[PDB]
C-alpha cells in the first residue's frame, strides 16, 4: 500500500506504547503520542493467526518400522518412500503456509496505515493540506488541547473551518 516504507520515511523507535502513534508540533512543542485502536486492531490479527496454527490434530498414528529388529528391505524402500515423500510435502506447505502468513502479515500494516491516514484526512476536511513525508500541514492554530480532539475523533470541522480557508489560499 505504500505507507510503511513508501512515503513515510521511517518509524519511531520511541513509541513503546503502541505499534502506531501520533507526533505533533505547534507553538508549544513536540510530543509523541500513541493510537490505541490502530495498534490494537493489528494486535488482534497477529495473534489470530497464532491461535490457528496451535490447533493440533486428534488423529493418532503407530510406529510402523523398527530400528532394533529391522523389517524387510523391499518394504523399507517403500515406507521410506512414502514417509520421505510426506516429509517433502509438509516441507512444502511449511514452505508455503509459513512463507504466506508472513507475506500477508506486513500488508496488514499498510492497510491499517492508509486507514488512519485517510481518516484524519476526513476530520480535518478542507482545513489542511498534505506536504510529502506523510504529514498534514496545519495553517491555523491548534494547540495541545486541539490536537487531542483529532486524536479521539471529537474534532469538529466547522469549528475551525473559516480560518484555515483563509490561511491556506493566502
Amino acid at each position: 500500500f505504500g505507507a510503511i516504507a513508501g512515503f513515510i520515511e521511517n518509524g519511531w523507535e520511541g513509541l513503546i506504547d503502541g505499534w502506531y502513534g501520533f507526533r505533533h508540533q505547534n507553538a508549544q512543542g513536540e510530543g509523541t503520542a500513541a493510537d490505541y485502536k490502530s495498534t490494537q486492531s493489528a494486535i488482534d490479527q497477529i495473534t489470530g493467526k497464532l491461535n490457528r496454527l496451535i490447533e493440533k490434530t486428534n488423529q493418532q498414528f503407530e510406529l510402523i518400522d523398527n530400528e532394533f529388529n529391522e523389517v524387510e528391505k523391499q518394504i523399507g524402500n517403500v515406507i521410506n518412500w512414502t514417509r520421505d515423500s510426506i516429509t517433502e510435502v509438509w516441507s512444502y506447505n511449511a514452505e508455503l503456509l509459513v512463507a504466506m502468513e508472513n507475506q500477508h502479515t506486513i500488508d496488514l500494516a499498510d492497510s491499517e496505515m492508509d486507514k488512519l491516514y485517510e481518516r484524519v484526512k476526513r476530520q480535518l476536511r478542507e482545513n489542511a493540506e498534505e506536504d510529502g513525508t506523510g504529514c498534514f500541514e496545519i495553517f491555523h492554530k491548534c494547540d495541545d488541547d486541539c490536537m487531542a480532539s483529532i486524536r479521539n475523533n471529537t474534532y469538529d470541522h466547522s469549528k475551525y473551518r473559516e480560518e484555515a480557508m483563509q490561511n491556506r489560499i493566502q
Binding site: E62, L63, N66, E67, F68
Partner: protein, 54 residues
C-alpha cells in the same frame, strides 16, 4: 547360547466361539497358556530413560 538346534515359534489368531487343532508326533514345543488382549495402548522404541511427572 551353546545350542545349535533351534526353535521357530509360530502363531495364529483364534476367533471367539471357535477352536484349534494340532496333530503331531514330534519336535513340538507345546503351549500351556494363551494370551488374551486386554484393550488399547501403545508401544514405541527409545534408548533413553523415562519421566513420569511430565
Amino acid at each position: 547360547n551353546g545350542l545349535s538346534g533351534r526353535i521357530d515359534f509360530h502363531w495364529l489368531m483364534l476367533n471367539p466361539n471357535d477352536t484349534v487343532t494340532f496333530s503331531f508326533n514330534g519336535a513340538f514345543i507345546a503351549p500351556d497358556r494363551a494370551s488374551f488382549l486386554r484393550g488399547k495402548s501403545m508401544g514405541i522404541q527409545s534408548g533413553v530413560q523415562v519421566d513420569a511427572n511430565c
